[PDB]
Amino acid sequence: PQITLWQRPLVTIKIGGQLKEALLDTGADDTVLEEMSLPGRWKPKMIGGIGGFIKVRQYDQILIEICGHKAIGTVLVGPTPVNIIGRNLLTQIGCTLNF
Amino acid sequence: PQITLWQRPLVTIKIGGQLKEALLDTGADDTVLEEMSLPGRWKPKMIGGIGGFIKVRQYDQILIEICGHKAIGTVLVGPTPVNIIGRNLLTQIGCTLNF
């Protein structure tokens, strides 16, 4: 679909069989989700945000559906203002910026 | 032009007679740039996300040239680690998300 930016580019995503609202974020290198349960082991990772660096839990090869498009990749879990879909998953769903 | 997301979508903008590199961020409500001087009055604002919050100065009615497109909008100036072009100006250049 084509998404204009007058409002926040929020879409429905599905992970672990659960529907969630998330933000299509082109300025985010990685996908960062609010505290939730994910299977497997996780690795430690640092991501730099507007106010500084934080620790997050990295889960790799996670299945997630973004606005109807299925993807499989790295998902980071930590304190975040909103569920963020970063470039690693936007590329998987073929999302591009246009003007 | 169509911009893919394999890398951060970085463009050159022209503001206040200065050329800067910036990140087109659909996840940012506002345009926030590193410390710089801007004409006119300003009001203090607080913005947050990953890492927390930072205080910035809000300047309204500021002209900016993005990818050759002359847009007018609000610009926040503060200790951000990266120059960010937010939705308030992305809309003015007709930037959309597609997949």
Ligand SMILES: N#Cc1cccc(S(=O)(=O)N2C[C@@H](O)[C@@H](Cc3ccccc3)N(Cc3ccc(O)cc3)C(=O)N2Cc2ccc(O)cc2)c1
């Ligand atoms: N909608 C929405 C929304 C609201 C509050 C916070 C948010 S948000 O927290 O994702 N957000 C917008 C993100 O695009 C992103 C912007 C960024 C800041 C510093 C360095 C790199 C990138 N970022 C950090 C980040 C980095 C990597 C990653 O993998 C995920 C996230 C960030 O700090 N934001 C604050 C920010 C708030 C308001 C602005 O005008 C500009 C920036 C989104």
